[PDB]
């Protein structure tokens, strides 16, 4: 299966690209702006089917914080430590922060 890029259109090998498990299609880091890491290399749910780690529902992209290194979804209104507002800075794991 070519599993061409989900959002960019183009064929690619299945090993050096992020392969979404649910969707079945892989994609380049540049297209979705995802850092190349072993955790995501295995295959992280692309933003097209991402879910909150609290309610397991998508949407609220501007109000949802996603980890740069690992794949985790945090809702500004129901994340692990709930916040009263949207952080002006980045809110992800320490490694994710950098």
């Amino acid at each position: 299966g070519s599993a061409r890029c989900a959002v960019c259109e183009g064929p690619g090998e299945l090993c050096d690209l992020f392969f979404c498990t649910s969707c079945g299609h892989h994609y380049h880091g540049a297209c979705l702006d995802t850092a190349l890491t072993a955790r995501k290399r295995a295959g992280w749910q692309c933003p097209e089917c991402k879910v909150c780690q609290a309610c397991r529902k998508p949407g609220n992209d501007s109000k949802m914080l996603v980890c740069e290194t690992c794949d985790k979804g945090y809702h500004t209104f129901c994340l692990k430590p709930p916040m009263e507002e949207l952080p002006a800075h980045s809110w992800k794991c320490k490694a994710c922060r950098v």
């Binding site: 959002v7 097209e48 992209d61 501007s62 949802m64 914080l65 996603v66 980045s90 809110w91």
Partner: peptide, 19 residues
């Protein structure tokens, strides 16, 4: 550094996808 995190990742995805 801004909420560009998922905001830029998924929202831009819509721009390139919907395009």
């Amino acid at each position: 550094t801004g909420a560009r995190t998922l905001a830029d990742i998924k929202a831009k995805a819509q721009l390139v996808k919907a395009q």
